[PDB]
Structures are given as C-alpha cells and as structure tokens.
Amino acid sequence: ILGKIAEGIKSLF
C-alpha cells in the first residue's frame, strides 16, 4: 500500500 509501512514489521512483531 502507498506507505511501505508493512514492508517489514510483522516478522519483528
């Protein structure tokens, strides 16, 4: 999605 916020975070949380 326009934001790249989920580009890498689920694997860390």
Question: Cα–Cα distance between 9 and 13 in angstroms, integer?
Answer: 6
Of 11, 12, 13, 9, the residue nearest 1 (C-alpha): 9
List C-alpha distances in Å: 13 to 6, 7, 8, 9, 10.
11, 13, 10, 6, 5
For the chain, what is the total number of helices (H) and then of strands (E)?
A: 0, 0
